Structure 1
Amino acid sequence: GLGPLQIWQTDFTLEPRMAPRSWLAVTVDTASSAIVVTQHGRVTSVAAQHHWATAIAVLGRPKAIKTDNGSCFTSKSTREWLARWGIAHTTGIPGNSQGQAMVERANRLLKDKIRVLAEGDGFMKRIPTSKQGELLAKAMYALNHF
C-alpha cells in the first residue's frame, strides 16, 4: 500500500576478468536492493533487452527503469521492447548529475566481489571461460543473500 515503488536502475560496466564476455549488465531493484547481473560480449541494444528479459524472470516486471543515455538504452529498438512490456523508461534529469548512484555503487561492490572470489580460486588475472558462469552466479548470491 505505502511500500516502495518498483523502480529499477540498470547500467553496463566493463570487467576484463570476464572476457571475452566482459560487459556486465547490472540491475538494482531500488525497492529491495536485490541485484541481477548477466554477462555479454558487446554492448548493444539487444544485450540490454536480453538482460532485462532475465531480470524480469527473476524479479517480476517493474513499473519503471532508470538508465543513463547510453545508446543501447535509448535506441528505437530498446524503446519499443520496453513499450511491448509496458514498462516506463526515464533517463532522469539531463545532466541529472546522476540519479543512479545505487546502480553505481552496486557496480563497484560487484567487481570487488568477483575479484575476491576469483583470487580465492587462484585466478589472479582473467577467469578461465568455463569457470565464469559459476563464479558470476556466486558473486550474485553473495551480494543478495544473507
Structure 2
Amino acid sequence: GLGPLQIWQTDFTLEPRMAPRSWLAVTVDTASSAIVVTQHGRVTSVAVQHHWATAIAVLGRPKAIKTDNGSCFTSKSTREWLARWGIAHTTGIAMVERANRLLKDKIRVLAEGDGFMKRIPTSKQGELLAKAMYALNHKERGENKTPIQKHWRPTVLTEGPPVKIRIETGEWEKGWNVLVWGRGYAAVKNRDTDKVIWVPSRKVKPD
C-alpha cells in the first residue's frame, strides 16, 4: 500500500545461471519496490523461512506478504512461522514478476560483463548476486526514485529532535533542538536564531 513494510510479494523463480542453487527466492515491497533475493538448491519449506528472515533483516518486518498457493508457501511449518512473526498472509495465484524479469536481466548483464556466458562459477555467485542487489535497490530505475530512497527516505539531519527548555521564569520554551548531551547538559540550538547554549539536562524536555 502507500507505505514501506505494508505488503510484500514473494515468489520463487528459476535462474539456471546460478546453478546448482538455481532457485531464487524473490521478495519485493509493493510500496518501495526494494528487492531481496536469496538462492536455494530446491524449493523447500525451510528455504522460504530462510529467505523471509533475510529480507526482514534487510527491510524490517512487514504487515503482510502475498504469495501464490503452496506448496512450501502453505506448509504447516510456514504458516506456523508466519504466525510466530505476526505476519499476515495472503494467498492468490504482478509486481514480483516484473522483479523477476529485472533481476534475471541484471544477472545476465553482470555475468556476461565478467566473461561468463553460461553458468556462473559457484564461488563468484554470491558477490554477483550482491552486486545485482546493489544495482536494483541503490541505482535509479528511470527518470523517476531508487528503492533505497523510497524505503528509507534517506537524509542528513543537522540537529536532534525538538525540545523545550525552562528559562528564568519556570516556563518551558519551545523553539529549540538538541545537538549533544554531555555531563548532564544538553547543547541546544534555537531553530529561529541559530543560537546554541548549554542547558542543565533537568531543564530540557521533549516537545
- For the criterion TM > 0.5, the same-fold answer is yes
Deviations 1:67-120 (A, max 9, x none): 001301001010000000000001147xxxxxxx10000001100110011000
Q: Cα 1:127–1:33, aligned 2, differ >3 Å: closer, same or farther?
A: same
Q: Cα 1:4–1:40, aligned 2, differ >3 Å: closer, same or farther?
A: closer
1:19 and 1:3 mapped to 2: Cα distance? 35
Per the alignment, residue 137 of structure 1 pairs with 130
Q: Cα 1:58–1:3, aligned 2, differ >3 Å: closer, same or farther?
A: closer
Deviations 1:16-50 (A, max 9, x none): 10011000000001121100000111101110000
1:5 and 1:40 mapped to 2: Cα distance? 24
Deviations 1:52-71 (A, max 9, x none): 01011011110000000130
Relative contact order (alpha carbons < 8 A, sep ≥ 6): 1 or 2 greater?
1
Q: Cα 1:124–1:2, aligned 2, differ >3 Å: closer, same or farther?
A: closer
1:18 and 1:74 mapped to 2: Cα distance? 26
Per the alignment, residue 79 of structure 1 pairs with 79
Q: Secondary structure at the match of 2:56?
A: helix
TM-score (structure 1 length as normaliser): 0.90
2:132 and 2:118 mapped to 1: Cα distance? 17
Which segments of 5 or more consecutive residues in structure 1 lack a partner in the other structure?
94-100
TM-score (structure 2 length as normaliser): 0.64
Q: Cα 1:90–1:42, aligned 2, differ >3 Å: closer, same or farther?
A: same
Q: Cα 1:5–1:55, aligned 2, differ >3 Å: closer, same or farther?
A: closer
Provide the aligned length of Structure 1 versus Structure 2: 138
Which segments of 5 or more consecutive residues in structure 2 lack a partner in the other structure?
139-207
1:4 and 1:34 mapped to 2: Cα distance? 9
Q: Cα 1:3–1:46, aligned 2, differ >3 Å: closer, same or farther?
A: closer
Q: Cα 1:30–1:80, aligned 2, differ >3 Å: closer, same or farther?
A: same
Q: Cα 1:4–1:37, aligned 2, differ >3 Å: closer, same or farther?
A: closer
2:65 and 2:2 mapped to 1: Cα distance? 20
Given candidates 110, 122, 125, the residue that maps to 2:118 is 125
Runs of 4+ in 1 over 6 A off after TM superposition: none
Q: Secondary structure at the match of 2:62?
A: coil
Q: Which is greater in Rg?
A: 2
Q: Secondary structure at the match of 2:73?
A: helix
Q: Cα 1:49–1:5, aligned 2, differ >3 Å: closer, same or farther?
A: closer
Contact 2:15-2:24 at 8 Å conserved across structures: yes
Q: How does 1:58-97 map to 2 (within 5 A)?
A: 58-92=58-92
Contact 2:21-2:42 at 8 Å conserved across structures: yes
* Bigger strand fraction: 2
1:21 and 1:45 mapped to 2: Cα distance? 15
**Percent identity for Structure 1 against Structure 2:** 99
Q: Cα 1:88–1:143, aligned 2, differ >3 Å: closer, same or farther?
A: same
